[PDB]
Amino acid sequence: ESTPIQQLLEHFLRQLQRKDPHGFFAFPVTDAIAPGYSMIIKHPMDFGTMKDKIVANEYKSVTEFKADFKLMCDNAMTYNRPDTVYYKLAKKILHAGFKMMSKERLLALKRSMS
Numbered sequence: 001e002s003t004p005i006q007q008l009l010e011h012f013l014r015q016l017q018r019k020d021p022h023g024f025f026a027f028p029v030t031d032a033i034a035p036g037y038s039m040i041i042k043h044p045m046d047f048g049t050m051k052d053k054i055v056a057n058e059y060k061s062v063t064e065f066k067a068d069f070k071l072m073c074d075n076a077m078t079y080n081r082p083d084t085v086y087y088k089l090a091k092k093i094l095h096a097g098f099k100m101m102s103k104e105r106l107l108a109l110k111r112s113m114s
């Protein structure tokens with residue numbers, strides 16, 4: 001079964017993945033679909049890998065989850081040119097998670113759960 005932190009992270013993940021309806025961020029980027037990806041991007045990340053990590057209870061904190069989320073977005077903005085769908089979508093998703101998981105919103109959540 002599940003734990004409170006897992007339920008919270010699943011919620012954040014679900015809200016974020018809704019902004020990627022075509023699934024560009026859904027599973028690991030292959031070298032076949034992105035030439036040279038593994039050369040340029042040393043630490044790949046995607047929503048599916050993150051979900052698996054939530055299920056395995058690997059995130060000890062929201063900070064650890066936010067780090068992988070930011071990594072996924074940063075990889076897409078690093079490997080792709082600014083005028084691409086991937087870069088623009090990564091920037092939109094990053095802004096959404098930054099707002100959703102802000103320190104201020106997390107403080108308020110903490111206060112409600114005291």
Ligand SMILES: CCn1cc(-c2cccc(C(F)(F)F)c2)c2sc(/C(N)=N/C3CCS(=O)(=O)CC3)cc2c1=O
Nearest residue numbers: 023024025029033034035075076079080081082084086
């Ligand atoms: C956002 C993660 N991600 C995902 C893909 C991707 C994955 C599965 C399926 C598809 C597709 F079928 F819709 F094409 C794309 C790709 S593909 C790709 C790719 N070939 N990017 C090039 C775009 C033009 S460029 O910026 O000049 C050079 C990199 C980058 C990513 C990516 O970061």
